[PDB]
Design a protein around this ligand. Structure first.
Ligand SMILES: NC(=O)c1cn([C@@H]2O[C@H](CO)[C@@H](O)[C@H]2O)c2ncnc(N)c12
Ligand SMILES: [K+]
Length: 538
């Protein structure tokens, strides 16, 4: 054993597990400013109910905490809470759970009666329950509450100390980010214009992955628009099955993307470096399902992926997966095809190999490639450790057909062949339906996709927290030192557009997840103004 490899992992493992890894002076770094400092944000902030009272996590909790100071509003908060529970109760007990809400919030004499719904809607919703139990029964009811809360309660909240406190939180959110903000750990993988390594916010202790983009390498390969495009894409998409962007900042030599940390490792590692090649169909099915949902979300914005291979699918602490490395994705102009000779050897669709125009098709070619590789333990057109000059592997993708073995079930064999059709016109999922045609394939007969997208399905494989499911730090491919490049001011503009600092919603989740919001979000005794919110004197 090499000690660089042992030490690198034990350090990463220690951080991953007092103070939850926070800094000693974290209460000073995240000290609220006096409200008198937040007048600029008070003007800039758009006064939108959905954003300030729901979408933004810390805003959501502060509005709820404000409504809980009034019995006349605490009921509405309890209704929206109960509706959420009803929306995740089993179809078996839906009918029952639907009766408590009605008998507890929707009766003239109920203890927590909410009156702003409408005597017509309560009855309209009352008949719906005798018809059939449905998780979307109270959709109109909960909406009627949002129509009332966004009126007077919202404007009363904007006048209260809780919204002032929100501005204070927003003042910290705006603070600049630098290399100081994080502490870097071992490298987890080579990719793109730099390397991916684990990092940790010093103030909060939350673990992330830092995808480094070396400045000298972007200029030398003219990948500037490609790096920027990756950043925007990661920002626009908000899917449970795609790496989420939390920060994007600049350093003297590189641009950095702070992404969700996936301690479970990539599927390429779980396919080849953990026992026999591939794994059981059960695992492939679950993963194929989540990948489908992740592709479905990327396709809603009409954005192709083109980069689907096992090393770009990752595993989190619980066993779920996310798609990573969106650097090859582009948003499509509606009704047009793109020419791009991009992709990985043995993972490019027949359309891309002929330098031919294509659309959303190459993604479903990749989905089939992954299902096959997970089950068979090898690429559909390349051996496990077989040396082929690119020219032939390419040929095989176009000319030769894949071969299946006893490892494949009838349904697994069927979904693969239907996803691995050379003619993109008659390829599964590439029809006008989109991912709907794929969700119905017999392969997904016991997979309740609606229940998967919610998160009520337990992953089949749970990674052990005290294991690093990755190659050792000294076995990671490295780059060659870039030479002859000098960073000019012409690129200072691109660096500025990229480095936009922290992303609001993820940042707020960081403060909530690490309990920083819990410990710091306090007020005076008896619910009085604390000094940082008192306008008489600091
Ligand atoms: N791009 C990313 O978000 C990530 C890439 N890797 C590793 O880097 C490899 C790709 O170079 C993958 O196979 C993983 O082992 C990651 N490992 C952990 N978390 C992440 N967010 C990533
Ligand atoms: K395996």
């Amino acid at each position: 054993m090499e000690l660089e490899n042992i030490v690198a992992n034990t350090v990463l493992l220690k951080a991953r597990e007092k103070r939850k890894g926070k800094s000693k002076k974290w209460k000073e770094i995240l000290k609220f400013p006096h409200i008198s400092q937040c007048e600029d944000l008070r003007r800039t902030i758009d006064r939108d109910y959905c954003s300030l009272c729901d979408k933004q996590p810390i805003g959501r909790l502060l509005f709820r905490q404000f409504c809980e100071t009034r019995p006349g509003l605490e009921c509405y908060i309890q209704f929206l809470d109960s509706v959420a529970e009803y929306e995740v109760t089993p179809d078996e007990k839906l009918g029952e759970k639907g009766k408590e809400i009605m008998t507890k919030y929707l009766t003239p004499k109920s203890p927590v009666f909410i009156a702003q719904v409408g005597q017509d809607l309560v009855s309209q919703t009352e008949e719906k329950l005798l018809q059939k139990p449905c998780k979307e029964l109270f959709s109109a009811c909960a909406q009627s509450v949002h129509e009332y809360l966004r009126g007077e309660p919202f404007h009363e909240y904007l006048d209260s100390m809780f919204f002032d406190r929100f501005l204070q939180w927003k003042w910290l959110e705006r603070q600049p980010v630098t290399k100081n903000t994080f502490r870097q750990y071992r490298v987890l993988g080579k990719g793109g214009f730099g390397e991916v390594c684990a990092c940790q916010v010093r103030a909060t202790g939350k673990m992330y992955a830092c995808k480094r983009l070396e400045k000298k390498r972007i200029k030398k390969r003219k990948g500037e628009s490609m790096a920027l495009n990756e950043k925007q894409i990661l920002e626009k998409v908000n899917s449970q099955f795609v790496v989420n962007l939390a920060y994007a900042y600049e350093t003297k030599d590189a641009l950095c993307l702070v992404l969700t940390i996936m301690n479970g490792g990539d599927l390429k590692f779980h396919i080849y470096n953990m026992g026999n090649p591939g794994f059981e169909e059960e695992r492939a099915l679950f993963y194929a399902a989540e990948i489908l949902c992740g592709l479905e979300d990327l396709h809603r914005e009409n954005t192709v992926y083109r980069n689907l291979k096992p090393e770009n699918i990752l595993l989190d602490d619980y066993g779920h997966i996310r798609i990573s490395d969106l650097g090859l994705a582009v948003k499509i102009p509606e009704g047009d095809l793109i020419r791009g000779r991009v992709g990985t050897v043995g993972y490019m669709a027949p359309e891309v190999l002929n330098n031919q125009r294509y659309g959303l098709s190459p993604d479903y070619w990749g989905l089939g490639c992954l299902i096959y590789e997970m089950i068979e333990g090898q690429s559909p057109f390349r051996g496990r450790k077989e040396k082929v000059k690119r020219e032939e592997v390419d040929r095989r993708v176009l000319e030769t057909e894949e071969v299946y073995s006893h490892k494949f079930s009838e349904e697994a064999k069927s979904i693969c062949k239907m996803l691995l059709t050379k003619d993109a016109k008659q390829r599964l999922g590439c029809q006008e339906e989109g991912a709907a045609e794929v969700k119905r394939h017999p392969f997904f007969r016991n997979m309740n996709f609606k229940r998967l997208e919610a998160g009520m399905l337990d992953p089949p494989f749970v990674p052990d927290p005290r294991a690093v499911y990755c190659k050792d730090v000294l076995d990671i491919e490295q780059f060659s030192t870039v030479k002859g490049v000098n960073l000019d001011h012409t690129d200072d503009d691109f660096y500025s557009k990229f480095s936009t600092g922290s992303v609001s919603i993820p940042w707020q989740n960081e403060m909530i997840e690490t309990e920083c919001f819990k410990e710091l979000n306090v007020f005076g005794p008896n619910g009085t103004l604390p000094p940082d919110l008192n306008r008489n004197h600091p």
